[PDB]
Design an enzyme around this catalytic site. Structure first.
Site, short mmCIF file in Angstrom:
data_model
loop_
_atom_site.label_atom_id
_atom_site.label_comp_id
_atom_site.label_asym_id
_atom_site.label_seq_id
_atom_site.Cartn_x
_atom_site.Cartn_y
_atom_site.Cartn_z
CB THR A 1 -0.94 0.01 1.21
OG1 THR A 1 -1.55 -1.28 1.36
CG2 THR A 1 -2.04 1.07 1.02
CE1 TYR B 1 -16.63 -0.42 -5.50
CE2 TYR B 1 -16.25 -2.21 -7.05
CZ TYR B 1 -16.95 -1.07 -6.67
OH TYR B 1 -17.96 -0.59 -7.48
CE1 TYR C 1 -2.52 -4.17 5.56
CE2 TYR C 1 -1.76 -4.12 3.30
CZ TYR C 1 -2.09 -3.47 4.46
OH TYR C 1 -1.96 -2.10 4.51
NE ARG D 1 -4.57 2.26 3.35
CZ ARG D 1 -4.28 3.29 2.55
NH1 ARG D 1 -4.81 3.38 1.33
NH2 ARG D 1 -3.44 4.22 2.98
CE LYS E 1 1.01 -3.83 6.71
NZ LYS E 1 0.79 -3.13 5.47
CB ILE F 1 4.61 -4.60 7.43
CG1 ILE F 1 5.16 -6.02 7.31
CG2 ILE F 1 4.60 -3.93 6.06
CD1 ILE F 1 4.19 -6.98 6.62
#
Ligand SMILES: [Mg+2]
Ligand SMILES: [Mg+2]
Ligand SMILES: [Mg+2]
Ligand SMILES: [Mg+2]
Ligand SMILES: [Mg+2]
Lengths: 296, 296, 296, 296
Positions: free
Chosen positions: C45, C109, C135, C140, C164, C205
């Site tokens: 990202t 999405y 992740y 997001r 993560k 991370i």
């Protein structure tokens, strides 16, 4: 069912030197009556119910009842509590002083379950013989009266005739009236007064009407007459003031506006409520300039 | 600053036939003392403060004070209100009845601004000379005490020594102790007791300790002794019960658990709180099976 | 399971005149190596993965692999997609270029169900024989990998070794490691790096490590060596920059800081990302002054 | 401004043996046309745009364009992306294949700022000469196009003529049309079709219309003629199916229902999308029984 609907005002409670300005209070109710308002709600959220003594609450309900005598204006008294025993007592107390109905907020802070909310409101409704309007405002209470609970209460308890929604949730408003079209859905959020009314809501309990009673009253009666074009026009024109009136937590902006308009003498709150920031004071004053504010 | 820290219990308030069971209350407090608890919190959220009379609050505080006499265990009395005049009054009364400090919840329902919260708590702190612990629980109050407001109150008022956080927000716990490492951050969220303590928090005000006082006491004391491996091991083992104790609104599950364990005589709440669903009753009973519950 | 843990950097992707500055990228990675980082994450990202072409992703992954050759630093390649067929391809692609493992973001999405998330990652994990790190960043993606889904994938698929988390939910972090203590929980949220590590997390991370790799790597290694006092101290010192790096959406602030520090040549993004406001530009610049930024 | 309004359908994309069922696609579009739909939206969210190739997106747009020739029905092609360069390419491609306009979703996952959204949509709008409808769905994208940004794009870019809103926010719908009454506000949330239309919205881009196009079309055209009692009556009758169609993430329920009605052959999704739970499958089948589903 006996109902209280139409254009209604959540009255501010003016203070002067730390006490309730009884003269100002009666004068403000007369101004609402004279500007087409259908009912007044003493000692609601906008009236700083949390910081008034029981005796001040009695005083404000009594002033509202006495001032509305001989008129068509009804008194829908705020009488909620997060303790069922106290809310039942406050309901009987409002009836004993001549209120036409009660507004009873969902219990705040202790977050009852849906079953608990049902038992709470059934106890209140069974305690009096005057109409009871539920009041859902999850942003303040920490809980939500579900659509199912509202409808169950509406169907099971005679006095319970609707709900004053302050939840920003037009989906829920559709859910309510699609499954129980007989209830009185009342807007508790001025900015979306017209959308709620145009979906079949039958009234508003307004903050903005403290300042602009004629405009909120005209909006509501246009809408109830299905003159939706005129109702929407007023709602759109009022959007800016409707939003600025929540720049800080209500009733901090509305009291600031009433003071700026000369409708109250003193910009006094009871702690933990206090005067707004110097910016929001200026922003409220600037937005007011676009509206015609009735005097006394 | 004078402080009250360590392992603390937000005491349930047992009812019998609608009355506070005073013998039971004292016996439960004794049980907490005997299992290593450092302080007891009468009439907090878990104690159903919202539905107790002023005299019942006095009663529970006095039993707590009396039961802790001759021990190191302190009484941190719940004494908050969303009305500043009342919160000041409740603090002064808690001092007069022998509390060692007060826990004062952020005003619920009326959503004061940050300025109002500062003035609210400054009034409370100036009214007594015993420690004051702020209490932030936005899911219940509808408001948040910002980090900046907490730090200002800690620095400006001698009596204010920290905050009980029930906000599910470990970022804020970092923010608080990174900018004001002298304050006492207290976990008000059992599932994350260890993460809060490992970041420098100095205690817990616990719901689970009602049922498992030895485990919560050992966790906290391990963490305070910097034995983080042992503290985390208890935190991990307690996760299932810590979460199931919030399947329904606290204190509905913890009272259900205390009853299932035989530590209270009857599963009685005051409305609007009520018994859990049959399904959640079964889930609570199922989760309890993996834990050793101390008796009297 | 084979794992990739420790202090890791989600590398920014510098652009120059609209193309990937391959020397700068290389120069930036050796700088990470020289300051104690254990692994680098190309095309995550923070690396603006959404606006890179497939070939560009290949170049950045290859530069990362070649620059880390002969050092202990590993390459954990970004290789996610919200389309499973593509996510499988990117995983194969990443393996073919010598990545030691892949970071695979939860589908954004299209909001897959938990069942769909399981089948998604099972397809990815079965496509290669190198470690796979889940992740979860629901702010997001619009979806959450539940604790149960993460644990099931960890237990059922060889290559999946942890997750993560960028979810601001330390409760979930306790949930994860309490029920599946063998997994590698990796902090994806710099401000709460220490609380996650102190609960048994095994790496970060990081965004901040782009600017301050020495401090983030020291924080991580302190924590893994159970020097929690020193790990917490760096976490506390880093809070201000850790927060300001998200004044606007990452990687807009971090690239701004890297440019202000003279570590990259021009402040170029690919649309829809763009330069920050002049106010946040100044805010970022002011926070950086309190930190010592290693050169090349 | 050139506009595309009225009753519109976000078309599902049927798969058979893993490939786009092109004959089924054309047949479903003819069914929409024959039931009063004013425009069809190929390869939107409901069309599983995320998992289609560039080849399949072109095939679906071409089938839509070809099927609508010689009718009044318009083709509003989905052509959005979270990378501006690709969104410009897709917009260009949509126009070249004869789409009447494009629907362009707000960038997902990468979270651009309001400045970035403005530049994103301005690049798209300047790239073609056909109408552009914005699409705000923050629950899926992780970002919100603010009212201010929407209005700026409407006023600054010729072809940008409105927004499809999927935000559960009637307040914002009031905000939009009160400050810019010339834009076309389009409901992207079937349950609240009527409230949006009754505030001056001029169309819907519907999921439910896939199953019940005649009902959605009648609702919309009643509302555009200010026959609000009839529009609201259909909105109320449709509430149960409108809600059940999001029991799982759209388009899982609608494809399930289309399959249950015999309108598509195979209940096939592309991963990470998958079949609904067995329970939800039954709940969808139950709710469908209360509605009359048109055939071919
Ligand atoms: Mg009327
Ligand atoms: Mg329902
Ligand atoms: Mg700060
Ligand atoms: Mg045509
Ligand atoms: Mg007509």
């Amino acid at each position: 069912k006996n109902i209280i609907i139409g254009a209604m005002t959540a009255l501010i409670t003016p203070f002067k030197n730390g006490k309730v300005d009884e003269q100002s209070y009666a004068r403000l109710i007369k101004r609402q009556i004279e500007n087409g308002i259908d009912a007044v709600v003493p000692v609601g959220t906008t009236g700083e119910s949390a910081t008034l003594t029981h005796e001040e609450k009695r005083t404000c309900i009594e002033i509202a009842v006495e001032t509305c005598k001989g008129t068509k204006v009804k008194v829908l008294a705020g009488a909620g509590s997060n303790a069922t025993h106290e809310a039942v007592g406050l309901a009987k107390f409002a009836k004993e002083h001549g209120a036409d109905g009660i507004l009873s907020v969902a219990p705040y802070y202790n977050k009852p379950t849906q079953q608990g909310l049902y038992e709470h409101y059934k106890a209140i409704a069974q305690s009096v013989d005057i109409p009871v309007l539920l009041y859902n405002v999850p942003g303040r209470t920490g809980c939500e009266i579900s659509t199912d609970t509202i409808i169950k209460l509406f169907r099971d308890c005679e006095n319970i005739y609707g709900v004053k929604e302050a939840s920003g949730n037009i989906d829920k408003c559709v859910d309510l009236l699609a499954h129980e079209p007989r209830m009185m859905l009342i807007s508790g959020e001025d900015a979306i007064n017209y959308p709620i009314l145009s979906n079949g809501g039958k009234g508003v309990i307004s903050v903005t009407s403290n300042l602009l009673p004629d405009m909120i009253s005209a909006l509501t009666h246009f809408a109830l007459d299905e003159n939706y074009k005129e109702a929407k026009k007023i709602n759109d024109e009022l959007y800016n003031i409707n939003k600025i009136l929540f720049c800080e937590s209500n009733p901090i902006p509305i009291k600031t506006a009433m003071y700026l308009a000369g409708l109250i003498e003193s910009l006094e709150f009871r702690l933990p409520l206090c005067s707004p920031s110097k910016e929001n004071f200026a922003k409220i004053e600037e937005v007011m300039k676009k509206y015609k504010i009735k005097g006394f």
